[PDB]
Amino acid sequence: GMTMFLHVVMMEFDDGIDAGFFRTVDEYVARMKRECDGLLLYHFGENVAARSQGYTHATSSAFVDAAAHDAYQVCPAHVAMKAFMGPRIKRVVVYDGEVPAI
Amino acid sequence: GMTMFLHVVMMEFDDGIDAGFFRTVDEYVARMKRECDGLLLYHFGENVAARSQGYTHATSSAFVDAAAHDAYQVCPAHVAMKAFMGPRIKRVVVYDGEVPAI
Numbered sequence: 001g002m003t004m005f006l007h008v009v010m011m012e013f014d015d016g017i018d019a020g021f022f023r024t025v026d027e028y029v030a031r032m033k034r035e036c037d038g039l040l041l042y043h044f045g046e047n048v049a050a051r052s053q054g055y056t057h058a059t060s061s062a063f064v065d066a067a068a069h070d071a072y073q074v075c076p077a078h079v080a081m082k083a084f085m086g087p088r089i090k091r092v093v094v095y096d097g098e099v100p101a102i
Numbered sequence: 103g104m105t106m107f108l109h110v111v112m113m114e115f116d117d118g119i120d121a122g123f124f125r126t127v128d129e130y131v132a133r134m135k136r137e138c139d140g141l142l143l144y145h146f147g148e149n150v151a152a153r154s155q156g157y158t159h160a161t162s163s164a165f166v167d168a169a170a171h172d173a174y175q176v177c178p179a180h181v182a183m184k185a186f187m188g189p190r191i192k193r194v195v196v197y198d199g200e201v202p203a204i
């Protein structure tokens with residue numbers, strides 16, 4: 001298709017998180033492309049920008065379209081990840097939008 | 103390559119921006135896409151996320167690798183783009199990261 005839907009979730013976590021937290025997140029990340037439809041990209045990692053503003057990590061994702069991102073809401077890997085990460089997240093900021101493919 | 107460098111700049115603009123501001127943005131961006139190398143994606147658009155935190159627009163971009171993003175930072179047409187937009191930007195936050203290629 002000529003476009004895709006980008007969804008980027010920037011996050012600042014509690015200071016208590018450990019390597020274990022990230023190990024479990026990565027396990028949810030792994031389930032995601034297996035389990036959700038229309039997912040082109042799905043990654044969780046460290047923010048290396050200078051002007052990160054305290055947001056140290058992000059989930060970055062691209063879907064074939066906004067409807068695939070809508071369905072991702074009940075993707076069980078995602079419902080589960082959200083429930084897992086939620087209590088440890090201090091702040092988030094999100095960018096969603098349609099962008100050219102590639 | 104297996105990975106690409108993602109670069110997302112979220113922005114809120116000043117209340118007093120002029121009527122054709124976004125068209126001028128698009129002009130600088132177009133000139134920049136003509137002149138600067140190693141871009142896999144570059145889009146300036148509206149942020150449609152509910153959790154936008156008031157960051158109404160973003161630039162989203164992907165480069166072949168970190169070196170290509172490094173060359174873009176110093177691309178004269180990119181520098182010009184920043185000189186125009188900077189004074190109209192009220193708030194900015196940035197995500198950079200290496201992510202799986204699409």
Ligand SMILES: [Cl-]
Nearest residue numbers: 119120123190
């Ligand atoms: Cl203006």
